Design a binder for this molecule. Structure first.
Ligand SMILES: [K+]
Ligand SMILES: [K+]
Ligand SMILES: [K+]
Ligand SMILES: [K+]
Lengths: 217, 216, 217, 217
């Protein structure tokens, strides 16, 4: 009581490949774990310029930054100081598919992410290889316990240039590194936004706002 | 001027699950602007039903959804001509249902013609074993595609003995006339069986639904 | 044991709906069970002229007509005279999805099918509603036992007018009406063909050739 | 002169992660490309003993070793000496999902593979993490052209210890590194087998036999 301060820092490195093309990105940021807000700056270190839509990475760049109510177990805050990991599949409607992992540790006031990201089967003319995405719409993730860990599923949509949406289904498994208390079925509303970026996206400023709830009464 | 603050509902569903035919009729009423509704359902054929009644309930109308001013209400616009929907329901254990509803309006009463079909439910699964408790509340994601409205929702049935059984809904809503097309939005749901008899020949069913646009 | 002839007959009625549009079709045919060949003539009785590619229905119009090698168990011929039923989902790459059931009985030398077929979510501009399909490619179905019944999965593809293919995944459950010996994992090669039809498909002549095998040695 | 001999060699390195646990494997082998047979020895170099069923990896360890008839275009042999790459998703019935990539080059008479393999969401209690798999059944892959490259889809099944099967759907994209003749829709029968292995699977002898065909008749 309590290793989680109302303001905390973040450092990350992501190593990855999309359609066989390796890349690496590093980031530093800060957030307010209790208001469920956070932001960070990201730099492409390898594989620049990135030949695919930068949006497909942004949800990989931590649910501790989630405003939780008193009446809902917070699975992620409990997990610390030791931390937790997640595994995620991201299945796009045109047969594109990404899978990512994050190992999350804590070093004093700073969370440290080790991220692996991989994607394949994106069509050369699809909205990802042509960089035709605008942003992720807001979302509501559904979280439920299975086999003693936490699952989260969310229907995601990328707004497209020239209108319409491009759909993706996320399936995440969250794994506390130690015994914590398990939440009941609940929801997390999200909104992730790229607030600014250069032309090749080599530098990105990224924000997220997330709040948990129990849905309709 | 066809949508009165209090409306009635009449429906018939004809269907089959794992090749077993059945039919259900229902009467109900709701408050379209409050996004609340309820109804009484009676199994007319194929009773007693050999499968979890819960797979049928979401088939038994987004007219009954509370829409804000700032969000276009596709469903209230479609009347008096009305609209139809098509829906696939994909269960994590390979069970799959598809349903259709053709919705018309007669005076103050909505009329549903529903077809429901399901296959490949495992005999030892929670559907055929009837081990479901209720649907969790949900948030549906609605977006336009090819001039019509799509709605996708991550659904989950609570199970006897704990845990959940997941289902992915994909719905297409089709107005039977030209209507204004909404921006990407959400509909929170909560559907509940309030009462039923032992073998579910009689069911009282409630839904509460509200539209919104997510996190500012 | 002997309730099957080297030549047998078929009668069927299918009732169905695609995208909410009801229809009905009847058919009569004959086949050579032990050779795995059959053909039939089909007539639209209701809902004509069908507004969707007829091809989506054709596999719905009996594995009794499969040549089975002596060394593979034949679940299908073995089930008669009590017969069997099947349930099938057919998932198309564009979100279109059909499910169908067949209850198969035997009356003397004639199999009788009671078929229900339903499909939804076919896009208005897609190859099914726009009737742009040419034929099913031949296929190899994979059959395996689960929970004391027989499963069959097959990767299907419709050739398209002006090139390319439109993919569909079939998952079938076959259920004998009496206890039968269960087969080992095996394959059925298929080739289904519309040999002739009239302009709007009110009348169709349909052939299938099917042989079981156990793959590369 | 043809860069493809009747007998050729193979060298590979795979780097990967399953459920967030990294590993690396190297292999050397040889095969007869015009006969569609090949074999190789594999050694775990990092991450061993592998904590998951080795079986999930084996298909990631080259369609060149496929016997093509003369009447079917051979996308793979044509692609050399410049070679080709593939991307593959492998979707398991219990929500486990792997994606892999292979970049294939040619050095003299030795193919060189650079392989990335990633898998997530395999349940702790599943047959992959519990190592309850026996072998892959033989299979028939379906190959078709799309967007000027070659697609291959295959229904796979792992035989399980003490009965039954565990199903996986493969979707592969093959990309020649230069312009080659595109084939028409066809099939490849496969049979992959671990012929021998030591106890924790640090050392594996792996064989594959593959033949192309056009289906019935
Ligand atoms: K863009
Ligand atoms: K129950
Ligand atoms: K056509
Ligand atoms: K084993």
């Amino acid at each position: 009581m309590s290793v989680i301060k109302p303001d905390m820092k973040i450092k990350l490195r992501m190593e990855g490949a999309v359609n066989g093309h390796p890349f690496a990105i590093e980031g530093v940021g800060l957030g307010k774990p209790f208001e469920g807000k956070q932001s960070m700056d990201l730099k492409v270190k390898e594989g620049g310029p990135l030949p695919f839509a930068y949006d497909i990475l942004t949800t990989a760049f931590n649910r501790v930054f989630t405003k939780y109510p008193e009446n809902i177990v917070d699975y992620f805050k409990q997990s610390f100081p030791e931390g937790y990991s997640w595994e995620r599949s991201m299945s796009y409607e045109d047969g594109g598919i990404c899978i990512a992992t994050n190992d999350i540790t804590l070093d004093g006031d700073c969370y440290i992410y080790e991220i692996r990201f991989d994607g394949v089967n994106f069509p050369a003319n699809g909205p990802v290889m042509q960089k035709r995405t605008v942003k992720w719409e807001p979302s509501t993730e559904k979280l439920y316990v299975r086999d003693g860990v936490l699952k989260g599923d969310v229907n995601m949509a990328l707004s497209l240039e020239g209108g319409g949406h491009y759909r993706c289904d996320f399936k995440t498994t969250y794994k506390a590194k130690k015994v914590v208390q398990l939440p009941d079925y609940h929801f997390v509303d999200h909104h992730i936004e790229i607030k600014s970026h250069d032309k090749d996206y080599s530098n990105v400023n990224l924000h997220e706002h997330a709040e948990a709830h129990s849905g309709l009464p």
